[PDB]
Amino acid sequence: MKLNISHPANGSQKLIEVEDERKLRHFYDKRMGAEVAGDPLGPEWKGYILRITGGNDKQGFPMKQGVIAPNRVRLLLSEGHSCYRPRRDGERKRKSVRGCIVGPDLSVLALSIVKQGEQDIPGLTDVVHPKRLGPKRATKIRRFFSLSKDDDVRKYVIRREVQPKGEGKKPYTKAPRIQR
Amino acid sequence: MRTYEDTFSGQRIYPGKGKLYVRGDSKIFRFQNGKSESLFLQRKNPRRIAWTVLYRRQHRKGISEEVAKKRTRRTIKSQRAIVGASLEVIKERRSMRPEARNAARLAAIKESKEKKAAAQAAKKAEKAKNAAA
RNA sequence: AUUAACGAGAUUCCCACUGUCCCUAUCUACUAUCUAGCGAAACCACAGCCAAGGGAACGGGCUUGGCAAAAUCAGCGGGGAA
RNA sequence: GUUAGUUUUACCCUACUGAUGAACUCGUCGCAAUGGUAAUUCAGCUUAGUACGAGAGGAACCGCUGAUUCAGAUAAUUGGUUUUUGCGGUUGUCCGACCGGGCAGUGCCGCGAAGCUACCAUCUGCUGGAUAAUGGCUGAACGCCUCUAAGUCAGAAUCCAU
RNA sequence: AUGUGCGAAAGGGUCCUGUAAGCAGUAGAGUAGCCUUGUUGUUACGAUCUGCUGAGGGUAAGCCCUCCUUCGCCUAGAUUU
RNA sequence: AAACUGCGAAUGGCUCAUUAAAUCAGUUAUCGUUUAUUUGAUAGUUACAUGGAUAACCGUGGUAAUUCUAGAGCU
RNA sequence: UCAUAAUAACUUCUCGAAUCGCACGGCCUUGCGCCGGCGAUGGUUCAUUCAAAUUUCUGCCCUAUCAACUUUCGACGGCUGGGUAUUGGCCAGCCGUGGUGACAACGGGUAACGGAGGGUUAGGGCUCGACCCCGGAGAAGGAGCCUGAGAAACGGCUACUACA
Ligand SMILES: [Mg+2]
């Protein structure tokens, strides 16, 4: 079985191999969106609480919030559902989905950290990843940089740095196109 | 080993007891004992049978409730570093209070006023030459 | 020679049904059973363990062998060419 | 050629299946003469696409797992049986009505423990000796040969024991 | 034949059936009365439903436990060696 | 470039199976109804500007199998 | 009982521009002031256009070895409602007993989509019309539906049947 662990605080992701069925007997009744103590995983994981986000079956099928069953069921999907993207306005396709009860059948599980412990994870909490793009709507800059109603918000626009590939010409800057 | 729950009456079932009945349309039923099985085959309704687990739950006899919604609703976290600049650089963009920011504003508006006056002066010069033309 | 209706008349097939059967199991009442009281009949040369032999050519009895231990109760249907 | 037509008696003697029993004081624990005897056949995997054969075709011992017929037990689970007349429903009539009851040889229906019971359910069914047919060893009679004439080896679902 | 005794009741356990009698109701399809005429106006009748109620009844006659629940019985009579 | 949003995809093209007052033809009615689009008119009873998501995107996956898709971070 | 207007009210209740491109103008308290043009995209109602859906009158080939048909479970009509974009036996309740027919109803056959029209000729006719234009229906057979002004759509989806 495979586990895909993600850390939203620092924004990092890793996957770990676990082969001991005895270690994972502690779930197998937990639902989607619940709390659990990750301490019995091991000593370096003491003082951790995990949130169950979802997984993939052995065939590749995902699970869907709101269907209470350990098996998989066919349903009549519509617009707005989680595991279907229609190709034309108004389509409704019948598909098969996995229930919201964890079991020994799943092929890959996935979890997120809610509260850390004292030990550190050798590949997860030691590196931190930044965000990708700053704000661009007018109200966002004022609240973000705490300016008042009349503080010339336009000037404070976070900009990126880009280098032209032409004869190593001196780079220039790129900006977010303030709206409203 | 494993255990099952009676379909008709909800009683618990250990290995070896009871039987398993498969209906014509590929639906599997389990009965803990003869009493459940016999009643089911007569098209009786479980809702109206006084000793069933479903009947008790439907009439709400002897059970209470629980909730923890507002506990998991307090999960809020902190901000993270942008790629625009160094995280410490990001903060100091609004670390300072309103003195130095205000001082720049007077210079900026004076620059704006100077350009507008130059435009008006240039326009008057442009108007004069146009008439002279 | 045909023939509608009729038949506790003889014969063949089909649907429903079932312990007729595969293959047997269980329950109830009245006897059989034991006791107190009453209390017969058919039948009977003498009687009553077998194998072989010869003989009126299929013996309980004869010849040669096998064997063989008091008094008795409930069933059974081989024989007594019952 | 066709249709319809009464099938009597066992309690006696013996034979057989079982169950008591007088004599040497009453008991407990044992030996074993004699009598009886029991297991049977098939299928699948591997050996094997092999030995053999030009080709087409196409085996066997050991090993593993099951099954058919028969025999001896047992009832945790499944099913059958209901006078447990246990609980409930219900028809007719009778006790003035309700409650509680009688009768309809067990009124009828639903469920029904205990006991009995079903390859309709579950468990179990051993190895020593001597031999026949046949194949052999040493070896004369008959200077050679020969499994037999003296001696001797292996050996069957057979025979006798466990 | 003084006992971890025997017997008769009782309590608890385990099982079978499936929610007792009685009381109450802002339940109940409506009909007939009486009025100060009502947001349920009351008085009479009314299969059934809801609550007290997984309650009531039965339970060894070839079920289990009780020194720690109660009440009783007891070192015989006759025959024989 | 990619992607969100808007529109069309209900037009064209093919065939003659069914259908005997049914389809169809000429001629009437909507004072008995709907109509994107086109054209023409037409609406006095914090305001220097309001709020949360999501795509594209970086990076971690499953199945032999598809114009299948999961969970994490931005707008 | 039209157009339009007035009165009393009501509404999980709408609409009356938090939208985009070009130009760069005019005033006097000289303020980061006020006013100003041409377009695009939208918006309530009315009118028009492309239409659509129903609908009045008359007109079809063979057959009597098809003469009486329709109403159980609407068949002809009246009333009160429901539903549809709207009328209507279209549907739900109550009530009358009607409707078609020898001037050929009802039923059966068609190697039958209808029409504008093709072939052959004194005149009158006989026969063909799947097929380039107009109208109708269908996407293997039946049914059911989402989006939209417009679909009972099939180079859209759901289920069964038969193939694969
Ligand atoms: Mg070969």
Q: Are B12 and B3 in contact (CB under 8 A)?
A: yes
Q: Which candidate from B83, B101, B105 shows the least CB-CB separation from A131?
A: B83
d(CA B92, CA B99): 14
d(CA A18, CA A25): 12
Question: Which phi and psi (to 5°) does residue B32 adopt?
Answer: -70, -35
Number of inter-chain CB pairs under 8 A, A vs B:
39
d(CA A144, CA A154): 13
* Token pair recorded at residue B83: 């790629």
Interface test with B, best of A7, A51, A158 (most B CBs within 10 A): A158
User: Is there contact between A134 and strand F, defined as CB under 7 Å from any strand atom?
Assistant: yes
In Å, how far are A38, A77, A133 from A12, measured between CA atoms? 18, 33, 17
Q: Which residues pair with A62 in a beta bridge?
A: A56
B94/A158 touch (CB, cutoff 8 Å), yes or no:
no
Distance B39 CA to G28 C1' (A): 100
Burial classification of residue A98, based on how many CB atoms lie within 10 Å of its CB (0-12 exposed, 13-18 middle, 19 or more buried): buried
Question: Which phi and psi (to 5°) does residue A26 adopt?
Answer: -75, -25
* Token pair recorded at residue A142: 């004022």
Structure letter (DSSP) for residue B35:
H
User: Is there contact between A115 and strand G, defined as CB under 7 Å from any strand atom?
Assistant: no
Q: Which residues pair with A35 in a beta bridge?
A: A51
Q: What is the resolution of this structure in A?
A: 3.0
Question: Which phi and psi (to 5°) does residue B110 adopt?
Answer: -65, -40
Q: Which residues pair with A49 in a beta bridge?
A: A37, A115
Burial classification of residue A48, based on how many CB atoms lie within 10 Å of its CB (0-12 exposed, 13-18 middle, 19 or more buried): buried
Residues 58-117 of B with CB under 7 A from strand G: 108-109, 112-113, 116-117
d(CA A20, CA A1): 9
d(CA A15, CA B56): 47
Helices (H), A23-165: 138-145
Q: Are strands A108-115 and A2-7 parallel, antiparallel or unpaired?
A: parallel
Q: Are B27 and B10 in contact (CB under 8 A)?
A: no
Interface check B105 vs A, CB under 8 A? yes
Q: What is the helix (H) or strand (E) element at residue B71, kind and residue range?
A: helix B69-72
Q: What is the helix (H) or strand (E) element at residue B5, kind and residue range?
A: strand B4-5
* Token pair recorded at residue B89: 């650089």
Structure letter (DSSP) for residue A179:
B
Q: Which chain A residues have any C-beta within 8 angstroms of a chain B C-beta?
A: 8-11, 33, 35, 114, 128, 130-134, 145-147, 151-152, 156, 158-160
User: Is there contact between B124 and strand G, defined as CB under 7 Å from any strand atom?
Assistant: no
d(CA A55, CA A98): 10
Ramachandran class of A99: left when φ > 0, alpha when ψ lies in -120 to 50, beta otherwise:
beta
| Method used to obtain the model | cryo-EM
